[PDB]
């Protein structure tokens, strides 16, 4: 379910159904890159091709989180990718913020 | 559990704040991230607390970030199209895994998605 249109837009059908894995999502981008080669294109990721997607979207959201808010502390801006990985894998529902100051982080966690 | 297990770089403080050491090093896996949250939930039980995720315990964390997430992305911008607002969790999953530098946005309208994608 990957095409490059004559309009210049890549359309990726992801996920295919109610199964959602990290290896799948990474493989998808691999194929996008293989199809593009050296050129770059906007991309539509169509996650609405089947009602089974939203069955998976509800299950991914149903997974629990006992944190009331989450401060994520790194040592450089690149650690933002690690925060997003964590929040994305875990479908974190609560307030979240990125810091590079532990004192800023801890103070923000006290704002409850 | 009444049984003593593994520290898991996890503590609930007397200040009522959870502190998670994640990632522990330069290795980054989805399973580890999930396991880390499982341990947070098991420790908390019925109660809820603010959490600090300390991703700055070692210089090897950022080095892993760059090593696993610096991969090329041939997409110039990404519109992720769902059916309902809850489908955003899938968008966040995809983008969390793939760590793209380009503009990304969530839609439930295909027309809106395409219009936005064409601001190229």
Automatic annotation (TrEMBL), chain B:
Species this protein is from: Arthrobacter sp. (strain FB24)
Protein name, entry field: Uncharacterized protein
